[PDB]
Amino acid sequence: NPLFSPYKMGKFNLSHRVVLAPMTRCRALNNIPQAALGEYYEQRATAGGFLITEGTMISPTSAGFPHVPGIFTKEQVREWKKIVDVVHAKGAVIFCQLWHVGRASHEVYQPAGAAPISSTEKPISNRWRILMPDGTHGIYPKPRAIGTYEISQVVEDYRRSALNAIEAGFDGIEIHGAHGYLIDQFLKDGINDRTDEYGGSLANRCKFITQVVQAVVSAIGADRVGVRVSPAIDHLDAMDSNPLSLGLAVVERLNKIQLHSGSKLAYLHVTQPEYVAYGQTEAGRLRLMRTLRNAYQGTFICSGGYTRELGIEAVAQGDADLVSYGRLFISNPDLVMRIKLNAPLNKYNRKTFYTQDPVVGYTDYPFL
Amino acid sequence: NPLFSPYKMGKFNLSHRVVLAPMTRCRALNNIPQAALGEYYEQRATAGGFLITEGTMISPTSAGFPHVPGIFTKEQVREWKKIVDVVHAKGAVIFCQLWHVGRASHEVYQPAGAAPISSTEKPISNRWRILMPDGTHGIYPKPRAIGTYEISQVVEDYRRSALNAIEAGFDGIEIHGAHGYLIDQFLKDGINDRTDEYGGSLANRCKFITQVVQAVVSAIGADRVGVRVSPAIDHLDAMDSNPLSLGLAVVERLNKIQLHSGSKLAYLHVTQPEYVAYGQTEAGRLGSEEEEARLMRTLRNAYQGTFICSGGYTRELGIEAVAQGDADLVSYGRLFISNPDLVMRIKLNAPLNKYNRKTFYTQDPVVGYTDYPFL
Ligand SMILES: Cc1cc2nc3c(=O)[nH]c(=O)nc-3n(C[C@H](O)[C@H](O)[C@H](O)COP(=O)(O)O)c2cc1C
Ligand SMILES: Cc1cc2nc3c(=O)[nH]c(=O)nc-3n(C[C@H](O)[C@H](O)[C@H](O)COP(=O)(O)O)c2cc1C
């Protein structure tokens, strides 16, 4: 089983290729990592396995879900350290994903009820819903388009949070630049209508992610930075007129950061749409992952719809070096050992993805 | 087995609940029903079974796939007549689906290379593609928003086409009001941005489908008219802000049409929404749990008459739908492509042939069309 062949991810010696994908779970009450997170990541940790945390706030403005952890305060750092220590005692490697939602927030999640910040003043459409703190669903408001200087302060929030993640003991960080959140609000020409130097051209639209990655590379080293994008996922109205060309532009800039710095990023991580969908429609079904992998010099993590079989095929055929798993890792704490043994996998319950119970739907999925 | 209890679809006594879902197959070269269509439908016909044809053009502007049949000319009527004959000879009931694609077309499919027509001037976005005549995937262009007063001319196209269909011997017609096509482009508030009497309110957005159904009911009789909608479908950018309320508003208008005509429609046919697409994201499923759970039954319970569910059904799922009361009839698409004798295979609980998507829309009169094997 090629999923259980070792992989050197820069300095990190992984014993298998099964990765915990980053998953918001909303158990970090009051934006403070709670003991339950320690239990949850401990359950999924394996010797030489790679974990990526749920998306984690870089600033007071970065949240658009309830009870999601931050790492922008010393208080947050201290509680994360207890979690990281427990993961490290099992021999796991763990990265903190740094998450700014940009316009995918709501006044209830913002200081002083200020407008969420974004590349644009355009709101997510009423297609989509935000999870409100009462468990109801709400409507995304109009964001405020941030100015040129402000963009550098947000870059600084990523830099300082990466330092905070090293202070907590994390092995590294991941830049959440996917799924229509703040970085993707700059990348996607369906969102970014700026007419300053961050908008228009492909090169301009990649400035923001290039600045973020470069700042965190300078702070903690490239080999402790992974970068996650999703050029073909249009979640939260995040469409690009040309996903292949946007993805290649990002890849070229990541390669260039590596060449300029003289170092290798931990990895590029790309989420794919589930192409099994729309099979029942007339035109719904009428190369990309692998083109991006081919163009990228370094470690590639694929994600989105993967199964044991699909993961095995991805590694064996060289589409990816590592395979991250989300929903199946929610319901299978011992996912790695089940994949190793080909044991049947527990079903997952969407209803408790985002609830606050520290046990139910969180740590009470059974082991083999 | 509840799938094989009989059912009175109004005028038509059916011997079982397994229905051939309408499926575009692009074998009707140059929009003429071909002899291949006769063999294909005859293969799937059973005594007392119901078939719905592939979407069929109502006018020169109504197509957005290659080699789909029309029924807007008497030459087409003559050729359909022969296909209907061989289906009737096997004791099946067959409806012709009247399909206008609206903006889901391309200049190559339009007379004189003109713009496709729609409720709006907004094109389907770049995330969707059209099948070109050569089998490449092309870009949906900018449509022309039809005038307030030309809407009645398209309504007339449905009327004349419905009369042609029954003239060919069809037991009736189904209005394709689903999947982002012309009717749905008036229905869905993600598409219909009109400022006239056909846009804005929910009432206004239902005007087009109401007038289409009332014209065909008036021409051919209510019990020969089926109506297909898909309030909750991700296809060709056909989003509505409130799918359950859109669906209920449409049902209400059909109930009203039935009360005024004094007779029930043949059925309401509803495509089940799918929820695979965004299950992998952070927020993609968030406003949709209640719709997944209950949209289909709620529409069914609201409608005075026969309900056909469609979308993802299997033998087990189809049995449950009927046993549970969620549907009266269950339509199958892709399993019917690959199993000419699907009804018998479902009856006997036999193995089912796999379907090959690569030959769904090719022009071959045999390969991937009539050469799937019987038991
Ligand atoms: C409940 C849930 C929470 C998620 N939270 C995040 C997140 O915080 N950051 C992120 O980049 N992706 C997030 N994702 C996407 C996953 O990291 C991953 O790409 C996806 O689950 C992989 O597809 P799979 O579930 O089929 O394995 C989340 C997905 C789910 C289902
Ligand atoms: C190749 C193909 C062609 C289709 N053409 C039509 C059509 O012309 N009219 C329509 O209303 N639905 C059409 N559909 C949707 C089907 O009628 C039906 O709703 C769907 O196939 C049911 O799901 P199933 O395939 O899982 O049984 C088509 C589906 C496919 C796969």
d(CA A178, CA A97): 11
CA distance A295 to A302: 14
The HSE-up count of residue A273 (CA atoms within 13 Å, CB side) is: 19
Q: Which amino acid is at B338?
A: S
H helices of chain A, in order, are 35-44, 74-89, 148-167, 182-187, 202-205, 207-220, 243-261, 288-295, 308-316, 327-331, 335-341
Structural domain includes residue B370: no
Contact assignment for A280 to B312 by CB distance below 8 Å:
yes
Residue A331 near residue A344, CB atoms below 8 Å: no
**Which residues fall within 8 angstroms of residue A241, CB to CB, at 6 or more apart?**
A189, A190, B126
| Paired tokens of B262 | 């004094």
Cβ <8 Å between B277 and A281: no
Beta bridge partners of A196: none
Q: How big is the CA angle at A248 (ends A243 and A249), to the nearest 5 degrees?
A: 100
Q: How many CB pairs under 8 A join A and B?
A: 90
Residue A253, Cβ neighbours under 10 Å: how many?
A: 18
Phi, psi of B140 (to 5 degrees): -65, 130
- Asked if A3 has any chain B CB less than 8 Å from its own CB, the reply is no
Chain A, nearest residue to B137 by Cα: A286
The answer to whether position A114 is within a domain reads yes
Whether A95 is in the pocket of ligand 1, judged by its Cβ within 6 Å, is no
**CB-count exposure of residue B279 (10 Å: 0-12, 13-18, 19+):** middle
Q: Which residue has the tokens 């889901």?
A: B104
Q: Looking at chain A, which residue has its C-alpha nearest residue B235?
A: A284
Is residue A364, in this structure, part of any structural domain at all?
no
In a domain, A368, yes or no: no
Q: Token pair of A175, please?
A: 């830049």
List beta partners, residue B225: B173
SS3 B207: helix
CATH number of domain containing A70: 3.20.20.70
**Rounded Cα distance, A32 and A63, in Å:** 13
Looking up tokens 């042609």 gives B164
Q: Flag whether residue A25 sits within 8 Å of chain B, measured between CB atoms.
A: no
Question: Could you tell me the distance, in angstroms and rounded to a whole number, from the CA of residue A327 to the centre of ligand 1?
Answer: 7
Residue type, B186: F
* Cα angle A185-B130-B237, degrees, rounded to a multiple of 5: 45
Q: What is the C-alpha radius of gyration for chain A, rounded to an integer number of angstroms?
A: 19
Q: Give one DSSP letter per residue of B149-202, joined into a string.
A: TTHHHHHHHHHHHHHHHHHTT-SEEEEEE-TTSHHHHHH-TTT----STTSSSH
The residue whose two tokens read 């699907």 is: B342
With CA atoms as reference, report the closest residue to B210 among B167, B161, B265, B172: B265
**CA–CA gap between residue B184 and residue B100 (Å, rounded):** 10
Please tell me what resolution, in angstroms, this structure has. 1.8
Residues in contact with B307: Cβ distance below 8 Å, sequence separation at least 6, in sequence order? B267, B268, B269, B270, B299, B300, B326, B327, B328, B329
The number of the ligand 1 atom at minimal distance from the alpha carbon of A55 is: 8
- Answer yes or no: is B128 within a domain: yes
Q: Which of B158, B181, B332, B369 is catalytic?
A: B181
Amino acid at A146: I
CA distances from B16 to B43, B88, B157, B173, B197 (A): 17, 16, 33, 20, 43
Ligand with smallest separation from the Cα of B68: 2
Dihedral angle sign, alpha carbons of residues B101, B104, B109, B111: positive
Q: What technique solved it?
A: X-ray
Q: Ligand 2: does its nearest atom lie under 6 Å from the Cβ of B118?
A: no
**DSSP assignment letter at B328:** S
Q: How far apart are CA B202 and CA B10, in angstroms?
A: 30
Query: For A328, which residue in chain B has the nearest alpha carbon?
Result: B280
| Side chain identity at residue A135, one-letter code | G
Could you tell me which residues come within 8 angstroms of residue B66 by beta carbon, excluding any fewer than 6 positions away? Answer: B26, B109, B131, B132, B133, B361, B363
Phi and psi at residue A83, to the nearest 5°: -70, -50
CA distances from B53 to A250, B28, B47, B64, B368 (A): 47, 12, 17, 16, 17
Output the six-digit token pair for B99: 């399909």
Q: Is B97 on the interface with A (CB under 8 A)?
A: no
- CA nearest to A302, candidates A228, A210, A209, A239: A228
DSSP-derived pairing of the beta strands B329-332 and B18-20 = parallel
Q: CB-based burial of residue B262 (10 Å sphere; 0-12 exposed, 13-18 middle, 19+ buried)?
A: exposed
Backbone angles phi, psi at B145, to 5 degrees: -80, 120
Query: What are the Cα distances from residue B352, in Å, to A156, A327, B24, B340?
Result: 59, 30, 21, 10
Ligand 2 centroid to Cα of residue A178, in Å, is 33
- The response to whether residue A62 sits with its C-beta less than 6 Å from ligand 1 reads no
CA angle B172, B174, B177 (to 5 degrees): 160
- Tell whether A284 lies on the interface with B, counting CB pairs under 8 A: yes
Question: CB under 8 Å to B30, separation ≥6 — which residues?
Answer: B67
Q: Report the alpha-carbon distance of residue B325 to residue B327 in Å, rounded.
A: 5
Angle at B292 between CA B281 and CA B265, to 5 degrees: 140
Cα A131 to Cα A25: distance, rounded to the nearest angstrom: 12
Answer yes or no: is B126 within a domain: yes
Nearest alpha carbon to residue A330 among A41, A134, A18, A102: A41
Burial (0-12, 13-18, 19+ Cβ within 10 Å), A126: middle
For residue B43, give the amino acid letter: Q
- Choosing from A18, A20, A24, A31 the residue with most ligand 1 atoms within 8 A of its CB, the one to mutate for a pocket test is A24
Domain count, chain A: 1
φ, ψ dihedrals at B65, nearest 5°: -130, 160
Spatial distance between the Cα atoms of A363 and A345, rounded to a whole number of angstroms: 15
B2: CA distance to ligand 2 center in Å? 23
Q: What is the DSSP string of A141-189?
A: -PPEEP-HHHHHHHHHHHHHHHHHHHHTT-SEEEEEE-TTSHHHHHH-T
Cα–Cα distances in angstroms (integers) from residue A278 to residues A274, A286, B289, in the given order: 10, 9, 19
How far apart CA A355 and CA A35 sit, in angstroms, is 16
* B116: containing domain: 2-359
CB under 8 Å to B97, separation ≥6 — which residues?
A: B22, B52, B53, B54, B55, B56, B173, B174, B175, B176, B228
* Torsion on CA atoms B289, B291, B292, B294, rounded to nearest 10: 110
Q: Is B369 domain-assigned?
A: no
- Considering the domain boundaries, does residue B275 fall inside one? yes
- B89 touches A at CB < 8 Å: no
Q: Which of B196, B187, B322 is nearest to B254 (CA)?
A: B187
Report residue B126 as tokens: 């770049």
C-alpha gyration radius of chain B: 19
Return the number of other C-beta atoms located less than 10 Å from residue B193's C-beta: 13
